[PDB]
mmCIF file of C-alpha atoms in Angstrom:
data_model
loop_
_atom_site.group_PDB
_atom_site.id
_atom_site.type_symbol
_atom_site.label_atom_id
_atom_site.label_comp_id
_atom_site.label_asym_id
_atom_site.label_seq_id
_atom_site.Cartn_x
_atom_site.Cartn_y
_atom_site.Cartn_z
ATOM 1 C CA UNK A 1 -1.167 14.153 9.126
ATOM 2 C CA UNK A 2 -2.129 10.471 8.155
ATOM 3 C CA UNK A 3 0.656 9.043 6.433
ATOM 4 C CA UNK A 4 0.713 5.581 4.075
ATOM 5 C CA UNK A 5 4.520 4.083 4.059
ATOM 6 C CA UNK A 6 4.653 0.943 0.473
ATOM 7 C CA UNK A 7 7.720 -1.182 1.271
ATOM 8 C CA UNK A 8 8.495 -3.689 -1.426
ATOM 9 C CA UNK A 9 11.887 -5.491 -0.309
ATOM 10 C CA UNK A 10 12.943 -7.707 -3.192
ATOM 11 C CA UNK A 11 11.535 -8.350 -7.442
ATOM 12 C CA UNK A 12 9.081 -11.189 -5.675
ATOM 13 C CA UNK A 13 5.928 -9.412 -6.002
ATOM 14 C CA UNK A 14 4.458 -10.833 -3.256
ATOM 15 C CA UNK A 15 6.453 -9.525 -0.293
ATOM 16 C CA UNK A 16 4.775 -5.793 -1.179
ATOM 17 C CA UNK A 17 2.806 -4.892 1.734
ATOM 18 C CA UNK A 18 1.914 -1.457 4.119
ATOM 19 C CA UNK A 19 1.870 0.460 6.799
ATOM 20 C CA UNK A 20 0.351 3.496 8.228
ATOM 21 C CA UNK A 21 0.460 6.035 10.663
ATOM 22 C CA UNK A 22 -1.147 9.009 12.189
ATOM 23 C CA UNK A 23 2.030 11.606 10.835
ATOM 24 C CA UNK A 24 5.562 11.217 8.870
ATOM 25 C CA UNK A 25 7.185 10.856 12.429
ATOM 26 C CA UNK A 26 6.052 8.163 13.352
ATOM 27 C CA UNK A 27 6.099 6.603 9.759
ATOM 28 C CA UNK A 28 9.145 7.638 9.645
ATOM 29 C CA UNK A 29 10.005 5.477 13.260
ATOM 30 C CA UNK A 30 8.545 2.911 11.461
ATOM 31 C CA UNK A 31 10.658 2.328 8.722
ATOM 32 C CA UNK A 32 13.669 2.390 11.464
ATOM 33 C CA UNK A 33 11.901 -0.373 13.606
ATOM 34 C CA UNK A 34 12.065 -2.343 10.167
ATOM 35 C CA UNK A 35 15.179 -1.986 9.429
ATOM 36 C CA UNK A 36 16.154 -2.611 13.235
ATOM 37 C CA UNK A 37 13.857 -5.690 13.292
ATOM 38 C CA UNK A 38 16.174 -6.947 9.923
ATOM 39 C CA UNK A 39 19.220 -5.930 12.057
ATOM 40 C CA UNK A 40 17.631 -8.357 14.961
ATOM 41 C CA UNK A 41 17.237 -11.008 12.770
ATOM 42 C CA UNK A 42 20.463 -10.993 11.200
ATOM 43 C CA UNK A 43 22.799 -10.716 14.662
ATOM 44 C CA UNK A 44 20.416 -12.680 16.933
ATOM 45 C CA UNK A 45 22.095 -13.043 20.145
ATOM 46 C CA UNK A 46 22.124 -9.442 20.787
ATOM 47 C CA UNK A 47 19.328 -7.834 22.889
ATOM 48 C CA UNK A 48 21.288 -4.099 21.690
ATOM 49 C CA UNK A 49 21.060 -3.525 18.042
ATOM 50 C CA UNK A 50 23.590 0.317 17.695
ATOM 51 C CA UNK A 51 23.590 1.002 14.241
ATOM 52 C CA UNK A 52 24.807 4.826 12.044
ATOM 53 C CA UNK A 53 22.795 6.675 9.247
ATOM 54 C CA UNK A 54 24.425 5.951 6.651
ATOM 55 C CA UNK A 55 23.739 2.419 7.511
ATOM 56 C CA UNK A 56 20.199 2.977 7.270
ATOM 57 C CA UNK A 57 20.461 4.419 4.258
ATOM 58 C CA UNK A 58 22.144 1.457 2.637
ATOM 59 C CA UNK A 59 19.306 -0.528 3.793
ATOM 60 C CA UNK A 60 16.656 1.725 2.585
ATOM 61 C CA UNK A 61 19.112 1.889 -1.425
ATOM 62 C CA UNK A 62 18.710 -2.238 -1.116
ATOM 63 C CA UNK A 63 14.981 -2.167 -0.831
ATOM 64 C CA UNK A 64 12.813 -2.788 -4.487
ATOM 65 C CA UNK A 65 10.946 0.111 -3.777
ATOM 66 C CA UNK A 66 10.040 1.965 -1.048
ATOM 67 C CA UNK A 67 7.517 5.353 -0.904
ATOM 68 C CA UNK A 68 4.890 6.562 1.240
ATOM 69 C CA UNK A 69 2.168 9.092 0.873
ATOM 70 C CA UNK A 70 0.903 11.635 3.208
ATOM 71 C CA UNK A 71 -2.187 13.683 3.910
ATOM 72 C CA UNK A 72 -3.088 16.948 2.574
ATOM 73 C CA UNK A 73 -5.579 18.418 4.192
ATOM 74 C CA UNK A 74 -5.922 21.499 1.221
ATOM 75 C CA UNK A 75 -6.712 19.818 -0.820
ATOM 76 C CA UNK A 76 -7.623 16.334 0.678
ATOM 77 C CA UNK A 77 -5.149 13.763 -0.810
ATOM 78 C CA UNK A 78 -2.068 12.545 -0.890
ATOM 79 C CA UNK A 79 0.950 13.420 -1.108
ATOM 80 C CA UNK A 80 3.581 11.255 -2.819
ATOM 81 C CA UNK A 81 7.378 11.113 -1.241
ATOM 82 C CA UNK A 82 10.194 8.911 -2.403
ATOM 83 C CA UNK A 83 13.003 6.573 -1.125
ATOM 84 C CA UNK A 84 15.087 10.085 -1.231
ATOM 85 C CA UNK A 85 12.455 12.165 0.980
ATOM 86 C CA UNK A 86 12.450 9.379 3.220
ATOM 87 C CA UNK A 87 15.776 8.696 3.700
ATOM 88 C CA UNK A 88 15.559 12.983 4.407
ATOM 89 C CA UNK A 89 12.844 12.683 7.455
ATOM 90 C CA UNK A 90 14.579 9.687 8.962
ATOM 91 C CA UNK A 91 17.669 12.229 9.109
ATOM 92 C CA UNK A 92 15.613 15.256 11.054
ATOM 93 C CA UNK A 93 14.056 12.786 13.046
ATOM 94 C CA UNK A 94 17.135 10.876 14.458
ATOM 95 C CA UNK A 95 19.427 14.142 14.853
ATOM 96 C CA UNK A 96 16.553 15.361 16.410
ATOM 97 C CA UNK A 97 16.398 12.368 19.370
ATOM 98 C CA UNK A 98 19.821 12.847 19.349
ATOM 99 C CA UNK A 99 19.292 16.691 20.366
ATOM 100 C CA UNK A 100 16.709 15.683 22.682
ATOM 101 C CA UNK B 1 -4.241 7.309 -14.174
ATOM 102 C CA UNK B 2 -1.459 5.757 -12.014
ATOM 103 C CA UNK B 3 -3.893 3.484 -9.391
ATOM 104 C CA UNK B 4 -3.006 2.339 -6.062
ATOM 105 C CA UNK B 5 -4.671 -0.754 -4.495
ATOM 106 C CA UNK B 6 -4.591 -1.207 -0.467
ATOM 107 C CA UNK B 7 -5.906 -4.317 0.388
ATOM 108 C CA UNK B 8 -6.094 -6.138 4.111
ATOM 109 C CA UNK B 9 -7.857 -9.455 3.956
ATOM 110 C CA UNK B 10 -8.478 -10.117 7.885
ATOM 111 C CA UNK B 11 -7.520 -8.379 11.234
ATOM 112 C CA UNK B 12 -4.312 -10.014 11.117
ATOM 113 C CA UNK B 13 -1.768 -6.949 9.653
ATOM 114 C CA UNK B 14 1.004 -8.254 8.316
ATOM 115 C CA UNK B 15 -1.386 -10.173 5.460
ATOM 116 C CA UNK B 16 -1.541 -5.949 4.354
ATOM 117 C CA UNK B 17 -0.269 -5.735 0.780
ATOM 118 C CA UNK B 18 -0.477 -3.481 -2.461
ATOM 119 C CA UNK B 19 -0.851 -3.744 -6.452
ATOM 120 C CA UNK B 20 -0.491 -0.869 -9.078
ATOM 121 C CA UNK B 21 -1.884 -0.166 -12.303
ATOM 122 C CA UNK B 22 -1.459 1.975 -15.192
ATOM 123 C CA UNK B 23 -5.324 2.716 -14.876
ATOM 124 C CA UNK B 24 -8.379 2.775 -12.512
ATOM 125 C CA UNK B 25 -9.954 0.116 -14.773
ATOM 126 C CA UNK B 26 -7.361 -2.344 -14.387
ATOM 127 C CA UNK B 27 -7.375 -1.640 -10.969
ATOM 128 C CA UNK B 28 -10.824 -2.775 -10.824
ATOM 129 C CA UNK B 29 -9.617 -5.894 -13.533
ATOM 130 C CA UNK B 30 -7.342 -6.590 -10.652
ATOM 131 C CA UNK B 31 -9.732 -6.509 -7.678
ATOM 132 C CA UNK B 32 -11.941 -8.900 -9.757
ATOM 133 C CA UNK B 33 -8.804 -11.310 -10.259
ATOM 134 C CA UNK B 34 -8.387 -11.207 -7.473
ATOM 135 C CA UNK B 35 -12.095 -12.403 -6.072
ATOM 136 C CA UNK B 36 -11.864 -15.197 -8.896
ATOM 137 C CA UNK B 37 -8.397 -16.359 -7.509
ATOM 138 C CA UNK B 38 -9.430 -16.881 -4.522
ATOM 139 C CA UNK B 39 -13.003 -19.155 -6.282
ATOM 140 C CA UNK B 40 -10.950 -20.891 -7.959
ATOM 141 C CA UNK B 41 -9.085 -21.765 -4.536
ATOM 142 C CA UNK B 42 -12.709 -22.812 -3.325
ATOM 143 C CA UNK B 43 -13.565 -24.535 -6.405
ATOM 144 C CA UNK B 44 -10.506 -26.335 -6.911
ATOM 145 C CA UNK B 45 -11.522 -29.232 -9.785
ATOM 146 C CA UNK B 46 -14.017 -26.822 -11.929
ATOM 147 C CA UNK B 47 -11.560 -24.594 -14.438
ATOM 148 C CA UNK B 48 -14.728 -22.187 -15.106
ATOM 149 C CA UNK B 49 -15.768 -20.144 -12.396
ATOM 150 C CA UNK B 50 -18.917 -17.730 -12.337
ATOM 151 C CA UNK B 51 -20.308 -15.601 -10.159
ATOM 152 C CA UNK B 52 -23.015 -12.644 -10.360
ATOM 153 C CA UNK B 53 -21.731 -9.190 -9.094
ATOM 154 C CA UNK B 54 -23.526 -9.489 -5.372
ATOM 155 C CA UNK B 55 -21.362 -12.109 -4.420
ATOM 156 C CA UNK B 56 -18.102 -9.818 -5.422
ATOM 157 C CA UNK B 57 -19.695 -7.065 -3.656
ATOM 158 C CA UNK B 58 -20.487 -9.446 -0.771
ATOM 159 C CA UNK B 59 -16.629 -11.558 -0.915
ATOM 160 C CA UNK B 60 -15.749 -7.077 -0.889
ATOM 161 C CA UNK B 61 -17.529 -6.650 2.444
ATOM 162 C CA UNK B 62 -15.894 -9.040 4.039
ATOM 163 C CA UNK B 63 -12.147 -8.447 3.606
ATOM 164 C CA UNK B 64 -10.837 -6.329 6.319
ATOM 165 C CA UNK B 65 -10.015 -3.046 4.661
ATOM 166 C CA UNK B 66 -9.676 -2.262 0.513
ATOM 167 C CA UNK B 67 -9.074 1.402 -0.734
ATOM 168 C CA UNK B 68 -7.189 2.614 -4.115
ATOM 169 C CA UNK B 69 -5.697 5.765 -4.621
ATOM 170 C CA UNK B 70 -5.134 7.094 -7.654
ATOM 171 C CA UNK B 71 -3.680 9.992 -9.226
ATOM 172 C CA UNK B 72 -4.281 13.733 -10.327
ATOM 173 C CA UNK B 73 -2.704 14.928 -12.861
ATOM 174 C CA UNK B 74 -4.234 18.705 -11.520
ATOM 175 C CA UNK B 75 -2.735 18.403 -8.065
ATOM 176 C CA UNK B 76 -0.262 16.055 -8.910
ATOM 177 C CA UNK B 77 -1.511 13.737 -5.658
ATOM 178 C CA UNK B 78 -2.922 10.742 -5.092
ATOM 179 C CA UNK B 79 -7.442 10.946 -4.290
ATOM 180 C CA UNK B 80 -8.431 7.870 -1.682
ATOM 181 C CA UNK B 81 -11.936 6.383 -2.724
ATOM 182 C CA UNK B 82 -13.206 3.508 -0.025
ATOM 183 C CA UNK B 83 -14.857 0.396 -0.464
ATOM 184 C CA UNK B 84 -18.089 1.482 -2.064
ATOM 185 C CA UNK B 85 -16.679 3.943 -4.737
ATOM 186 C CA UNK B 86 -14.470 0.087 -5.955
ATOM 187 C CA UNK B 87 -17.610 -1.786 -5.420
ATOM 188 C CA UNK B 88 -19.587 0.598 -7.873
ATOM 189 C CA UNK B 89 -16.678 0.782 -10.864
ATOM 190 C CA UNK B 90 -16.023 -2.519 -10.821
ATOM 191 C CA UNK B 91 -19.618 -2.876 -11.726
ATOM 192 C CA UNK B 92 -19.819 -0.232 -13.893
ATOM 193 C CA UNK B 93 -16.732 -1.600 -15.584
ATOM 194 C CA UNK B 94 -18.513 -5.632 -15.818
ATOM 195 C CA UNK B 95 -21.509 -4.054 -17.265
ATOM 196 C CA UNK B 96 -19.725 -2.337 -19.741
ATOM 197 C CA UNK B 97 -17.579 -5.603 -20.432
ATOM 198 C CA UNK B 98 -20.628 -7.646 -20.670
ATOM 199 C CA UNK B 99 -22.632 -4.843 -23.520
ATOM 200 C CA UNK B 100 -19.836 -4.926 -25.285
#
């Protein structure tokens, strides 16, 4: 289902940005890639970045704002979800890819 | 009602940004202010910027993407609206402020 991700890195309003995806899983992957890009910048000479779930969660907590909207066909509107919901959906995604 | 405005000025994805407001009218005012800021930049030595509705509509048409989401208490979800709906709500806003 069409999912819209809203991100505000810091208190600076001009940093507000968004991205959209065909599904919740792709959106969650998008959040992970955002963190991975941050890690690449903080570890520039490392071609392979590794992290544990708690570190990604800490990153999300540090963002000034992170939320998403998921399309619901029953009402043809977008259901809002907060940081905690996103953290949990990322967990299920990462644990599944691990067991896959 | 809480309204979220999504704007993508050009085909450049990094230009995607958003802003939110307490109401639809304040969001529409936000779109007008966005256009007014553009006009100020294109007419730097003019402290007073004036424009007709058709010019604002043309500006909106030129944006790569412009849409909004309005909270609906009945379902506790966000109703999506496109560029045309926004143009029309701006028209009603501007015509009212004119007759006020």
